[PDB]
């Protein structure tokens with residue numbers, strides 16, 4: 001589990017969004033596994049605006065942060081998981097590491113702040129939903 005908290009925004013995996021996230025929806029995209037909902041309190045987090053290919057993610061299934069290299073966000077075939085069928089996901093970054101379904105929502109960070117959230121796993125990769133393209137997360 002987990003989310004990004006930037007301004008009056010809460011960024012979560014679409015597949016883990018609550019009734020309340022949907023009830024206060026801002027934006028959502030199933031191709032990205034992303035949902036954004038409005039928040040009453042303001043958030044501690046800063047979004048990266050950059051093309052860094054190195055950073056650190058939280059792995060909740062190892063209670064550990066791991067430094068990774070990762071591909072630029074792209075349109076990737078992900079095999080079938082407990083929360084999705086085998087499908088094309090867009091704006092996805094892949095690194096070599098550990099990701100179980102429960103690890104979705106853990107942060108990936110670089111020197112510029114939050115890059116994305118764990119969204120895929122299996123066959124020794126960890127996939128992350130890029131949010132660096134979402135410039136509207138920074139104001140309003």
Ligand SMILES: CNCc1ccc(C(F)(F)F)cc1
Nearest residue numbers: 014028029030031032089090
């Ligand atoms: C509920 N969201 C559905 C969805 C939105 C956008 C796309 C894409 F951009 F890829 F065309 C695919 C699926």
Ligand SMILES: [Zn+2]
Nearest residue numbers: 050052110112
């Ligand atoms: Zn960066």
